[PDB]
Write a protein that binds this DNA or RNA. Sequence first.
DNA 1: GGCTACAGGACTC
DNA 2: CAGGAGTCCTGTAGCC
Length: 341
Amino acid sequence: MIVLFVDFDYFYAQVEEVLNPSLKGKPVVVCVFSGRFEDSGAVATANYEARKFGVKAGIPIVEAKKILPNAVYLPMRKEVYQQVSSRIMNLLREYSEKIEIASIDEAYLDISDKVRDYREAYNLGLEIKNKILEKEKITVTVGISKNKVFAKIAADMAKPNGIKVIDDEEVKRLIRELDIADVPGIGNITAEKLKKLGINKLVDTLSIEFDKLKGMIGEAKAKYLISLARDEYNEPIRTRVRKSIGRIVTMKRNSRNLEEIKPYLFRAIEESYYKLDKRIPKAIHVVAVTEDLDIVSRGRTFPHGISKETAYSESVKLLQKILEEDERKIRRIGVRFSKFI
DNA sequence: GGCTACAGGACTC
DNA sequence: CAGGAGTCCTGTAGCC
Ligand SMILES: Nc1ccn([C@@H]2CS[C@H](COP(=O)(O)OP(=O)(O)O)O2)c(=O)n1
Ligand SMILES: [Ca+2]
Ligand SMILES: [Ca+2]
Ligand SMILES: [Ca+2]
């Protein structure tokens, strides 16, 4: 198989520049303002000019400002970025019927039936890059390899505005050398453990006893790493169908008083229903982010679709459950709907 | 034993 | 000083 993965560069920030070219050359930080106080909130992303200096997704806005007080801080305008994203995805659809839209920012294309080899694949990549540039003036990075994992890794290595191929031989190389923490799906926790029995690289999962790997990280993850190490990983590029839709908001102050939380919970329900559009869910979960930043949830599944009215009453019951079984105070509250008809 | 629901864990962008 | 959205896996307990 030949997979070509596309990753839009610093997407949110770049869209902002496209819309306001004077931002070009400046550090731009896209933020999610929470409303608690002057600049409370976090960074969603930032462009290369801000990133070179340590401004990264997730850090507090206030901290980012300590680092770059004269950078341009803009509020996230997701609806805008989604519109630009949709237009770009449609352009990619022209290069292949088998396409997987992984997120607002990434897409995987199985171009096996399009090119006979990596030379042609690379050229196809150039072609896509230029098309996107000429139509939307957005730069992207292309990664090409035998499966999704290594195509993604390829682009991680080449961004921004790059393109890169990883042949069978580098796959083998990578398997020996590549930091196993740099493998998609391996986070700090998990990595700690694999760079905890000398597994420091993919190849190491092959020699370790299996029940050992699996005792640390679980069966699915071990299998996954092993399959990659054997260079036998294969996952089909398939149309992604949304499985849940929800909304979560940060409350002005923490609380565990029901009447004080309700308004937030209710607004989250309203916005969620809106996004549902024509989908009818049978399951509803109320999600709470506690004062220590821990996540708790309670859900219920019905044998029929959930009306907005049933959503309202059922959410209050689930929220009560949360409160009555966790003595912590809540900081963020939302709902997530799933199991669509 | 293995399938279901549910709740927590971990990861990704 | 810590926002928003979405996915997959796993432990536990009921049930066949
Ligand atoms: N913690 C995060 C991480 C990422 N994002 C969003 C999701 S889509 C948007 C894309 O930004 P970039 O292209 O700058 O991110 P990278 O592709 O470089 O990782 O980043 C976000 O909102 N919060
Ligand atoms: Ca990305
Ligand atoms: Ca990106
Ligand atoms: Ca990692």
